[PDB]
Design a protein around this ligand. Structure first.
Ligand SMILES: O=C(O)c1ccccc1[S@@](=O)Cc1ccccc1
Ligand SMILES: [Zn+2]
Length: 257
């Protein structure tokens, strides 16, 4: 099915998922001069102290760190959000080279990777129902640049050898996602979509302005994963990012001056 190759990549997705050419697709380029500070935005609250991670899975597209969302533990609220959004999983998008990898861009600048912490609106009961709603999801996006190592990312890096191929998973309990955040919570926000099929238009995007630094050795290990399953020809999991989509009738708001 879909992927990131010449034959099944982003340019082909619209044939099975027509919403790929929709009115609120993600990612987008964030033009900093056009984004406007919004006084109506409330303070952003990232409450991950009670987070309960469970497993890490190579799904043939990226790797997902999954959480127990059966209760209000790790939640995101405030900012542009109405209500409480529960963390369900996080994953990354990255490149084959440090000059590319992120999905959102900032004044056309591409970062080496991008972290997505996916949350669903608790008013909808479960993730499946939330993805049938225009305000069903909130994704916290964080850029990664190559420089100093990110200590809080090392546990993820070290388990990747165990889930090299599509379909493999490993226990991944007691992981603290607080260790993946930058110091500042300044952000840009706009209404968009999931960046992977089915590309559903249910996401309030909150993209942090401050990138986190990770080491070249850390990202190099992301690039050793495989898109293929065990026993199949090796196709390195790199460049699993969708490029910027038309902004159309949308405005990007900034939480800062
Ligand atoms: O799929 C991609 O994203 C992809 C990206 C770049 C080059 C090739 C591919 S697919 O041919 C690899 C693949 C996937 C699943 C099972 C076996 C093989
Ligand atoms: Zn993503």
């Amino acid at each position: 099915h879909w992927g990131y190759g010449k034959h099944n990549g982003p340019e082909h997705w619209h044939k099975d998922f027509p919403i790929a050419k929709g009115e609120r697709q993600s990612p987008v380029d964030i033009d900093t001069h056009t984004a406007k500070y919004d006084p109506s935005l409330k303070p952003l609250s990232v409450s991950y102290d009670q987070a309960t991670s469970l497993r890490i899975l190579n799904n043939g597209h990226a790797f997902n760190v999954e959480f127990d969302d059966s209760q209000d533990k790790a939640v995101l609220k405030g900012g542009p959000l109405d209500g409480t959004y529960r963390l369900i999983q996080f994953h990354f998008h990255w490149g084959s080279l440090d000059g590319q990898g992120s999905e959102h861009t900032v004044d056309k600048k591409k970062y080496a990777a991008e972290l997505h912490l996916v949350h669903w609106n608790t008013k909808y009961g479960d993730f499946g129902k939330a993805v049938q709603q225009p305000d069903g999801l909130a994704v916290l996006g964080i850029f990664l640049k190559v420089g100093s190592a990110k200590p809080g990312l090392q546990k993820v890096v070290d388990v990747l050898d165990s889930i090299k191929t599509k379909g493999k998973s490993a226990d991944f309990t007691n992981f603290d996602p607080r260790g993946l955040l930058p110091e500042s919570l300044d952000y840009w926000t706009y209404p968009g979509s999931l960046t992977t099929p089915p590309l559903l238009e249910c996401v309030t995007w909150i993209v942090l302005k401050e990138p986190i630094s990770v080491s070249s050795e850390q990202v190099l290990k992301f690039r050793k994963l495989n898109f293929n399953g065990e026993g199949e020809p090796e196709e390195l999991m790199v460049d699993n990012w969708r490029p910027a989509q038309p902004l159309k009738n949308r405005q990007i708001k900034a939480s800062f001056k």
